[PDB]
């Protein structure tokens, strides 16, 4: 799975991360950043966007 900075030491961090959960879980929370606030409930991705 794609987990950024899972192994980093001696620094504060950049500020943002992308951390997909493994495919047994949902992994929809990283594909709802634009055109997906109050239009589509927190269970689906938006395939038109």
């Amino acid at each position: 799975v794609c987990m950024t900075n899972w192994a980093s030491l001696g620094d504060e961090g950049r500020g943002l991360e992308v951390r997909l959960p493994p495919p047994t879980d949902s992994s929809v929370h990283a594909y709802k950043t634009v055109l997906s606030r109050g239009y589509i409930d927190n269970a689906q991705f938006n395939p038109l966007a």
């Binding site: 055109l35 606030r37 109050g38 239009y39 938006n46 038109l48 966007a49």
Partner: protein, 49 residues
């Protein structure tokens, strides 16, 4: 426009409560009565004069 609109989904839901209200079929029923009350009244002032 809105945030994420589709002109097919949005026009379909907005025109859906207008095609259920039978005002298209209330026009035709009032039309033939207005025709049928016309000839029975045009020939009601033409047989008097």
């Amino acid at each position: 426009t809105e945030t994420n609109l589709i002109p097919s989904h949005h026009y379909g839901k907005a025109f859906a409560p207008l095609f259920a209200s039978n005002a298209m079929f209330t026009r035709n029923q009032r039309a033939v009565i207005t025709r049928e009350a016309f000839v029975c009244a045009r020939s009601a002032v033409a047989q008097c004069q």
